[model samples]
Target: KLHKGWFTEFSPDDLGAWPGQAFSLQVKKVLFHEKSKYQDVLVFESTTYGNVLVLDGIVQATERDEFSYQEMLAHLPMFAHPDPKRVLIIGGGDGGILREVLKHESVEKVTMCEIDEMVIDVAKKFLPGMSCGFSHPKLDLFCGDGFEFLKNHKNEFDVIITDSSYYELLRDALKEDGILSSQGESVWLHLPLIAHLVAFNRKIFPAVTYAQSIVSTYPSGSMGYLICAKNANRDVTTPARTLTAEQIKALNLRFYNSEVHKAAFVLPQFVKNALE
Candidate 1:
């Protein structure tokens, strides 16, 4: 709720993801607000976080810290593969995921399927910094169902980045040595759900790992990513290709580095116990 110039997030009531806890940011002014076909779309100017994007009243991105989410989510599975030539991104309407995916010189093409066209339009008009990749020639935008798109693309991609649900279809779309990275929940608020994802994934893929990233505007101060490999010999937990400090800066990677990739998978004792 945006009340008294402050936007508050209680997360979703049914899931009670954040019970008795809420995250809020001071709003300077409302830039864009409307109900899209799927959810509520909002873009607002903020006092401290610069520009902020919200979906269904949830903070999705802030100009001040989007790099943290974008970099970590896009680069984890990217660097985990020796060389990812073709990649697919599902549900990153703001183009932040595409922006980060394009940063890798090894990437030749990126396919993005975002259900909401409003989010992309809102971001392009208000959040110019994160939506800069909309014009890149490497991207193939699909404003439709990501699941349907994947059903037709089998044994086609080297890497896949998504936050959507198509668990069974994911394996069919990847090549023999393909690697995938999907959004994971926070340990502070969603350990049980996170544990379930890991348990379910282990049965489908031989190599499954979880990693965390710091995104201040999220319900918790951080979020996580679930990375998996179709091939058992491929270790998705560590980087197959490492980058030096010089390479990191050259790629404009603010959050994900070679060492940071390894550290992201280290779980707390409680989280480890819950997953097992």
Candidate 2:
């Protein structure tokens, strides 16, 4: 909803997850708006942030800062594994995750399942740079919910990725030596929730790590991911494949480098103490 030329995404009653907080972007023009079966979808051109995607009133991404979220989520696990031939993505309707995963030459196939067809259709029409991976030969895109598809397939892909936290359902779809990475909530607002998620994951996966990245457009200016590896010996915090400056440039990596990957897991003092 726009107020005085700015679209504001806010807490319903100021008593929910983020108390007394809201994020807004100045709208240059309203590009697309529709109510899908699941949620309200919106795409607009901002004054400075390029095109913006809003789902259910939350800013999904701005073309200016989309790389911050996509690179860390996709590359953290992608680089953790020495060679990832098969990958599975759930709920990345914007196609940023799919695009980043394809940068790896070893990935022979990528299967993605997004519940909302509307988000994909809207992305194709408005966010061209982000929605570029839908046409790739390696992709097998599916439209439906998450666990229903996972129930039919098990122990298949090398890496499993999802937008929301679905640990058990996603775990069954991975190969023996697989890695699972999902969006960990913001520490600034959801520290308690993230701490609980990290602690619970410790018992399920042999190796687990929590990391955060800076995305200017995100609510708290910081976003996090939970990384859990199936194998006990797997060191997901360190990159298995280190890219040189030239390789980094060739891959079009803007926010993530080998060094950045290593330092990301290093937490703030309060966050470090809480997670422990």
Candidate 3:
């Protein structure tokens, strides 16, 4: 048997068509495991990735290379908007997204809604680097349904990041010139879902664009994001705030910058064909 000892296997069930295929990671030790009220939560140390967090048997982030995913998710939408003073993050319990979101000085308030409190606890105990976001002064942490939070707060946020789901409800919670971004699966395997998201967003928001970043732990080692702007004439590809060399150096960005932001929207012919 290839999987002998405490090996971890990740199977695809969401939009991935690779039913029989799976990714296996050699586990070094199990740090934590629990059945949260919302879903199963797991944190473990591995030989390759150092530390890994899994939600419902899906890999959320790895210590070795988590900056790429988190940075792109937070910065892309942040820079797209003229001034993202108030930002809302939905379902990023591990705090990786929040940590990155606070980097921008323009953000005055960051509200994170995570349904599972256990995930945050585990992250605080084990993943200290990512969880440090909880201590930031601007954070307003809430443990509740993101849907309910949005229902009560309308036209409140400058930028909304739907890290979990509920894209439709999030749109109403954003300002007229606001921006929204969320995971858009893989361009190789989940083209149909990406198409559907793009189509749905086109009717709701004027400017819709897709950007991708590489993540080795994911199904295809690459993941895409769906970004939309409320204003139709707005350009989501270019950054609204340009950073100088010293400013970029101070930020210590691992994956996203002004050049990367512009480059991420340059899709291949195959992807362009599907989205258009």
Model 2: which ten-residue window has the lowest total lDDT? Answer: 11-20
The TM-score leader among the candidates is 2
- Against the reference, the lDDT scores of all candidates come to 0.86, 0.88, 0.83
Alpha-carbon TM-score of each model against the true structure: 0.96, 0.97, 0.94
- By TM-score, how accurate is candidate 3? 0.94
Off by over 4 Å in 2: 14-16
- Cα lDDT tens digits, model 1, 37-156, are 799998899999999998988888898987888888888888889889999998898878888998888988888888888999999999987999999999888887667878999998
After superposition, the stretches of candidate 1 with alpha carbons farther than 4 Å from their true spots are: 14-16
Higher-lDDT candidate of 1 and 3: 1
What is the lDDT, from 0 to 100, of the residue 243 in candidate 1? Answer: 90
lDDT of 3 by residue, 233-264 (tens): 77989999787778887988877889999999
lDDT of 2 by residue, 1-276 (tens): 878889988865633267688888899999999898899999999998999999987889788887888999999999999889999998899989998999999999999988899999888888887889999999998886667889877899899887763577667888999999898889999888988988988988988899998889887788899999999999999989788999999988989999999999999899999988
Separately for all candidates shown, the number of backbone clashes (residues 3 or more apart, or on different chains) is: 0, 0, 0
- Please report how far candidate 1 places residue 56 from its true position, in Å: 0.6
lDDT of 2: 0.88
| Per-model RMSD to reference | 1.6, 1.4, 2.3
